């Protein structure tokens, strides 16, 4: 199960559309990680079966979040427009920290 996802970045592409991209995020202060904490059920994220609960987002259009606190990745997924480039990589151990 968890061992064979493949923990190396990964850069996807999905699609806004007439939907949302499908993904909640959590997060804290500058250094606390962007984590993708809910995935909606036949959205952008879930069709493209490359993202999942416990992927850190690393950057978004080519901006580095790695620092990002929770309400400024929040901002820049809500403004990178229609086609939005993630690039994600695997974290459960850093996600379990959030996720009850």
């Given at each position: 199960?968890?061992?064979?996802?493949?923990?190396?970045?990964?850069?996807?592409?999905?699609?806004?559309?007439?939907?949302?991209?499908?993904?909640?995020?959590?997060?804290?202060?500058?250094?606390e990680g962007?984590f993708?904490?809910?995935?909606?059920?036949?959205?952008?994220?879930?069709?493209?079966?490359?993202?999942?609960?416990?992927?850190?987002?690393?950057?978004?259009?080519?901006?580095?979040?790695?620092?990002?606190?929770?309400?400024?990745?929040?901002?820049?997924?809500?403004?990178?427009?229609?086609?939005?480039?993630?690039?994600?990589?695997?974290?459960?151990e850093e996600y379990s920290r959030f996720e009850?």
């Amino acid at each position: 199960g968890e061992e064979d996802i493949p923990r190396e970045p990964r850069r996807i592409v999905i699609h806004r559309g007439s939907t949302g991209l499908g993904f909640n995020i959590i997060g804290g202060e500058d250094g606390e990680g962007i984590f993708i904490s809910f995935a909606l059920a036949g959205g952008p994220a879930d069709l493209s079966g490359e993202l999942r609960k416990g992927d850190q987002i690393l950057s978004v259009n080519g901006v580095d979040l790695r620092n990002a606190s929770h309400e400024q990745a929040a901002i820049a997924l809500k403004n990178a427009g229609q086609t939005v480039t993630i690039i994600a990589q695997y974290k459960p151990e850093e996600y379990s920290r959030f996720e009850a």
